[PDB]
Amino acid sequence: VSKTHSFMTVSLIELWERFGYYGMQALIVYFMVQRLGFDDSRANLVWSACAALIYVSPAIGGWVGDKILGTKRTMLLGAGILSVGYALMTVPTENTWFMFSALGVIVVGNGLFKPNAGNLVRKIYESKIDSAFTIYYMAVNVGSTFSMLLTPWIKDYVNAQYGNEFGWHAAFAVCCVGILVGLGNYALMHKSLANYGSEPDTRPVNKKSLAIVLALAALSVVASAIILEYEDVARVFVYAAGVAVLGIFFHLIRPSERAGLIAALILTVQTVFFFIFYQQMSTSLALFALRNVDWDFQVFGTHLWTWSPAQFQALNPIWIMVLSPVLAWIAAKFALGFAVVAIGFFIYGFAGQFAVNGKTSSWVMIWGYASYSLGELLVSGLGLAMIARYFMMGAYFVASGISQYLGGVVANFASVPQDLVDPLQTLPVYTNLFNKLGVAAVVCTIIALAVLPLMRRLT
Numbered sequence: 001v002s003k004t005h006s007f008m009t010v011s012l013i014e015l016w017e018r019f020g021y022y023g024m025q026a027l028i029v030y031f032m033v034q035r036l037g038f039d040d041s042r043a044n045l046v047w048s049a050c051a052a053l054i055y056v057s058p059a060i061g062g063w064v065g066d067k068i069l070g071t072k073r074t075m076l077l078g079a080g081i082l083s084v085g086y087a088l089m090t091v092p093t094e095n096t097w098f099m100f101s102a103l104g105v106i107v108v109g110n111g112l113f114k115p116n117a118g119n120l121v122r123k124i125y126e127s128k129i130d131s132a133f134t135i136y137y138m139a140v141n142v143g144s145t146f147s148m149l150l151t152p153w154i155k156d157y158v159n160a161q162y163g164n165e166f167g168w169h170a171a172f173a174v175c176c177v178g179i180l181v182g183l184g185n186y187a188l189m190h191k192s193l194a195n196y197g198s199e200p201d202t203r204p205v206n207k208k209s210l211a212i213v214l215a216l217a218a219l220s221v222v223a224s225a226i227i228l229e230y231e232d233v234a235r236v237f238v239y240a241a242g243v244a245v246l247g248i249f250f251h252l253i254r255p256s257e258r259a260g261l262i263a264a265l266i267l268t269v270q271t272v273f274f275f276i277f278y279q280q281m282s283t284s285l286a287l288f289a290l291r292n293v294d295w296d297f298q299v300f301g302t303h304l305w306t307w308s309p310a311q312f313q314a315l316n317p318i319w320i321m322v323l324s325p326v327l328a329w330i331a332a333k334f335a336l337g338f339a340v341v342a343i344g345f346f347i348y349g350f351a352g353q354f355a356v357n358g359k360t361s362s363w364v365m366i367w368g369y370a371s372y373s374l375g376e377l378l379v380s381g382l383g384l385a386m387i388a389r390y391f392m393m394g395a396y397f398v399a400s401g402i403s404q405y406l407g408g409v410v411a412n413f414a415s416v417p418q419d420l421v422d423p424l425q426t427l428p429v430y431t432n433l434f435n436k437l438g439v440a441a442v443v444c445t446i447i448a449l450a451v452l453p454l455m456r457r458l459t
């Protein structure tokens with residue numbers, strides 16, 4: 001039919017997938033802390049381990065859609081499995097194993113969905129793939145905005161008319177029917193828009209490999225659930241992957257090439273840093289929003305409205321959509337990014353010195369997330385081939401996986417013990433982390449500009 005139509009369908013199903021996913025992420029930590037009894041340390045480590053899994057998962061999932069099942073087939077399978085996972089989240093049973101298994105299913109589903117939906121856009125546009133991917137990114141952002149604003153409100157509302165459960169599980173249901181809606185979209189536009197795409201979807205499904213894939217999917221679901229349960233297991237796995245990438249980069253260097261390689265290394269550790277800084281919003285910043293922020297949002301000086309802590313995360317995509325058209329009107333952009341993130345974290349750090357009544361800020365979250373999200377926008381060029389100045393393109397992925405977990409253990413530095421609820425005492429330990437992160441980010445700014453001549457040497 002058209003290229004715009006195909007890109008439309010893939011951006012649509014993408015939009016709804018991300019709607020579901022972020023609809024869950026916005027509430028997951030608060031679920032583990034408030035509804036479940038987890039302490040914020042375990043919440044951080046677990047959610048970040050899961051995040052690492054989710055972000056390293058599409059590696060395998062991408063190869064499956066290209067080389068075994070149909071890219072469209074794999075995408076769909078991922079969507080269905082995702083729906084199943086959220087469905088598992090929706091049943092009101094406070095059984096840690098149950099939720100962990102649900103998370104495993106979500107991980108697998110994502111690994112199968114994300115990289116193949118991304119391949120489609122690339123095949124629908126065969127340099128205008130950037131024109132596509134930007135719009136794509138925007139669709140992702142509006143979806144994620146809608147969900148991150150909707151689901152916490154569902155959580156609160158249902159928790160009022162009914163007792164504790166569902167409330168949370170209701171929200172997870174919202175995610176689920178989000179996925180179902182997306183799948184309905186695809187179904188109503190399948191051969192219509194998509195039509196042509198995939199490396200091996202031109203034939204019927206090979207039931208042997210489909211079987212072995214579903215089996216191994218169950219197996220990976222189990223592996224996931226177990227990794228999530230035991231903190232030490234997660235620690236060992238992640239640490240192992242760390243030794244792996246350490247070794248890979250160790251061997252890569254073993255005269256003229258080093259100008260590209262060392263630069264790539266400094267770059268990849270910078271990426272690690274940046275992803276820690278990102279991971280902070282999912283955890284410690286979210287927790288901070290929950291325990292040390294006046295949920296009463298005032299437009300100086302009236303009242304509308306009243307935040308629900310999770311909804312503060314919705315500030316991230318909103319600001320992205322707002323400041324994107326402004327920026328529309330060179331590894332130094334990395335440095336700019338790090339600096340902007342820095343002053344964001346200083347705003348969170350300076351949240352104590354001003355606007356404080358115990359738990360008070362509100363606007364600190366807004367300007368903070370503004371700066372931080374701008375900083376996110378500034379580093380769109382994380383591309384694996386971008387550091388490819390010389391394996392490293394691969395190891396980069398795994399390192400970028402571990403980065404998340406590390407972000408978790410960083411957010412653990414502002415772990416508030418459960419028996420401490422006097423916010424007047426909790427506020428500093430957050431602003432101590434946040435003021436400390438601000439300084440760290442500035443060092444990263446120095447790193448970026450210092451390694452900039454090494455980018456000039458190769459050229």
Ligand SMILES: CCCCCCCCCCCCO[C@@H]1O[C@H](CO)[C@@H](O[C@H]2O[C@H](CO)[C@@H](O)[C@H](O)[C@H]2O)[C@H](O)[C@H]1O
Pocket residue numbers: 142143145146149150153156305306307308311
């Ligand atoms: C596709 C992109 C679309 C983006 C727009 C998305 C719209 C978001 C819809 C849901 C918004 C709900 O988010 C907001 O949650 C807060 C906190 O519970 C609600 O707060 C509401 O109930 C609380 C508690 O009874 C009251 O104190 C408050 O006066 C009232 O507004 C708001 O009514 C709601 O606006």
Ligand SMILES: [Zn+2]
Pocket residue numbers: 346349435
């Ligand atoms: Zn300071």
